[PDB]
Amino acid sequence: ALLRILKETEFKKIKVLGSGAFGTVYKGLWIPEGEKVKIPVAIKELREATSPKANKEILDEAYVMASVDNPHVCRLLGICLTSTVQLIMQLMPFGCLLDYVREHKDNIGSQYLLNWCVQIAKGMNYLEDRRLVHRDLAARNVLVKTPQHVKITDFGPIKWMALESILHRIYTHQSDVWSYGVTVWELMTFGSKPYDGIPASEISSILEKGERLPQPPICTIDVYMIMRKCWMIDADSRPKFRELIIEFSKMARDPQRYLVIQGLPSPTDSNFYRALMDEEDM
Amino acid sequence: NQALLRILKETEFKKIKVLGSGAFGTVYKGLWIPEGEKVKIPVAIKELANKEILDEAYVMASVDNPHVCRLLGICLTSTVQLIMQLMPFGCLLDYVREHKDNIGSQYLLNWCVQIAKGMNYLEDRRRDLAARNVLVKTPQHVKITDFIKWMALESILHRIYTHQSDVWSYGVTVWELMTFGSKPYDGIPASEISSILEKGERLPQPPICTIDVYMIMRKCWMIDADSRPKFRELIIEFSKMARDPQRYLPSPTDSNFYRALMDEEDM
Ligand SMILES: */C=C\C(=O)Nc1cc(C(=O)Nc2nc3cccc(C)c3n2[C@H]2CCCCN(C(=O)/C=C\*)C2)cs1
């Protein structure tokens, strides 16, 4: 296996970073046995309600999440089986792409937005190839390791779910393509809230009437066409993740043609970033 | 070349704590603050012509080996401040001292293989080496950093430093590891080591070393530099002994856990 079972004595919560999923993300510190070092980690402590065999349920799914090997998706490194289960992984210092794009609503060039879509599409394709449904894809679940390396998190949201998911709980790799389209919309709207004002209980109604999200101001039709095609009522007519990688990489080679913004640090800074924080292959 | 180093501006860094000291500087600690960002990244800071130092600093930023340290940054303001990735375990000298018991045979021999792997790389790229200058990333990954009782005889006599003079320094470093951090020539002070080396039968055999291991140490200390073994030969012989370590002297779940958190560089 690749999952390490931890004890309460070998790690400690020191702060709180946010709530999410069935638990709360707590910045932690890992203390190896017989060592004096403190290693920063991320700790997600679920809710209280479990069951005696729920741990067997969680362990089976935890083993799968500990087996992913892609630079854009991310790996579950450890777990703690207490009254409330605690999950341990590597700490992403920049948080998520949603808040990062919101707080940096200016210094986000065109190249950064298109390359983020390429990397998110690369991670989602890896999940599709491993035949794993995500179901919770969104800008809040795209973590930023370095400003040039994003990673998808929280594997297994009415305004992010496909129509077939809201109507009768149909979750497929094409339903994630819908979630990919909403995630791209949030990035290119600089963190705007989708369907702002329109209550959840009425989203399925407006989708049944042909209302998609508005074209963001910085998106040409070439980018907006891709977003709309991900939101077709026919799931099989939506583009595949392998096709999104190719088209978004095509636009990345000429970013100012496909993104219109008013107003990607040199390898000197990229080598400095990866030597300190991002030593994985890609 | 140019895209391997370019840091400085104290406006981006601060020293915060202490981790021992060194003759050339203090390791301290520190935190790097990227421009326009709110995160604090732990780094190591060595606070000790600028065109001279910068040219040599470029060279230290050009090494690409898992067991050789790259110079990531340097502030040319107060006194040559050096930036690298922070090694939480300190050096291999203190670590072997602090854990001088639960160090199995495989751990000691593989450390010698990795030091020989790093030293060979330095020879491959064409002045020190010691247990104190071997930093520990993880307890499975050691790394050579920073650039009398460790110098070769020709180095002590008249400043002759070659890749074979490092083999002498490699031999003294191996002695320190297998003596669990003992001090070489304990007691003999100031100028005198060169006198005993021209007539001596080398440093004593450590208690845990078989004759096969002590012979390698003896051959590294020959008065003829060209008769000393090559770093490429030390890798092969120490790897041979590592496959049967108890003859000559954790689980992948934990190794993957170490590297996913602290050591994401290739094997
Ligand atoms: C991909 C890794 C994995 O398997 N699981 C997860 C890792 C994280 C994580 O590292 N979150 C994180 N790191 C932070 C550093 C500094 C500040 C903050 C706020 C922060 N966070 C988040 C904690 C909860 C997740 C939501 N957060 C957002 O900002 C919203 C997008 C903050 C999580 S899962």
Author numbering:
A (entry chain B): 702 to 857, 877 to 983, 989 to 1007
B (entry chain A): 700 to 747, 755 to 832, 836 to 856, 878 to 979, 990 to 1007
Show the paper's wording.
In addition to clinically validated targeting of Cys797, our analysis showed that EGFR contains another cysteine residue (Cys775) potentially targetable using a molecular bident strategy. Cys775 is located in the back of the ATP pocket behind the gatekeeper residue Thr790 and resides in a restricted, less polar chemical microenvironment. ZNL-0056 is the first compound capable of targeting a nonconserved and partially buried Cys775 (behind the so-called gatekeeper residue) located at the back of the ATP-binding pocket in EGFR. To visualize cross-linking, we determined a crystal structure of ZNL-0056 bound to the EGFRT790M/V948R kinase domain at a resolution of 3.3 Å. The structure was obtained by soaking AMP-PNP crystals with ZNL-0056, and density for the inhibitor was only observed in one copy of the resulting structure. The structure revealed covalent bonds to both Cys797 and Cys775, though the electron density for the C775 adduct was weaker suggesting reduced occupancy. As expected, the benzimidazole amide core forms a hydrogen bond with the backbone of Met793. The thiophene ring tucks beneath the gatekeeper residue Met790 to form hydrophobic interactions as well as a polarization interaction between the sulfur atom of Met790 and the Pi-system in the ligand. Next, we were also able to identify two cross-linked peptides from Cys797 and Cys775, supporting the conclusion that ZNL-0056 forms simultaneous covalent bonds with both these residues intramolecularly. In summary, both mass spectrometry and cocrystal structure confirmed that ZNL-0056 targets both Cys775 and Cys797 in EGFR.
